[PDB]
Design a protein around this ligand. Structure first.
Ligand code: DKA
Ligand code: DKA
Lengths: 150, 150
């Protein structure tokens, strides 16, 4: 994965996000509701010290609320977990594209509102032309308003 | 779905095909190995009377061989089953794009050889820009040579 947000302002990505689309390099990373990289983002909480708290949801027969922290690195756009989180692109107000790397790649197109942003899905597809994705999912506005996008 | 192969020669699509990519309007149509529209095409056998026998595989804990017939209609590119099969495009020698319609849409990019044809995946993505797909899958060359793409 050869794409990062130059000049990322991590502060400016705080608050509410929607997992509108997901892609991964193996079907099994996303295929089931229980699939390991099937995580829904609720909110991004950047610490004062420039780390990133992630509020998400994960189905494990329960939609479970889950709080994790991604530690800063020397590169503004890359963070470590427990496995790396890369930020590709964000306009801060509407969309944010990110990938998680073990290679067992998974990327999402986050958006601010429970709507289908065709502009943001274009960029996300463009950012994935380069990657070896074998499963892509997207969620309708109804499903975006529910726990675990049921 | 507003795209059909004008001037389809059904005879010329006979024989060996690979289900390289799949897309559907709901995740549940493709998400599991047991998902209803998760069918792998083996061979296409057009009858003398212009019908289409489909040899496929479907996982139901067994990869099961399955023989079905799609009856001709007034339109060369549309066939009925038991639910319609539409043929979008084929160059006969390398690729064939088709959709199945109940609307619960599912489409595949079939290819002749167990290889990743980037040209055919482009056309297939172009034919799906128009459709309300929420799950896309693709299979590597190894998986194409196995029962049920395991
Ligand atoms: C910059 C936004 C990153 C979103 C982070 C999602 C990471 C989930 C990790 C996990 O699978 O437990
Ligand atoms: C023209 C090629 C069409 C392929 C047909 C695949 C239909 C499978 C129907 C079913 O789900 O049982």
């Amino acid at each position: 994965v050869t794409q990062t947000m130059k000049g990322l302002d991590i502060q400016k990505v705080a608050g509410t996000w929607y997992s509108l689309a997901m892609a991964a390099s193996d079907i099994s990373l996303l295929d089931a509701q229980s699939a390991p990289k099937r995580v829904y983002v609720e909110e991004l909480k950047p610490t004062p010290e420039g780390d990133l708290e992630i509020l998400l949801q994960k189905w494990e027969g329960e939609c479970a609320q889950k709080k994790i922290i991604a530690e800063k690195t020397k590169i503004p756009a890359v963070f470590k977990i427990d496995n790396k989180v890369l930020v590709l692109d964000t306009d801060y107000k509407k969309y944010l594209l990110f990938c998680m790397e073990n290679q067992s790649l998974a990327c999402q197109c986050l958006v601010r509102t429970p709507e289908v942003d065709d502009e943001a899905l274009e960029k996300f597809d463009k950012a994935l032309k380069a990657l070896p994705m074998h499963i892509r999912l997207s969620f309708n506005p109804t499903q975006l308003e529910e726990q675990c996008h049921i």
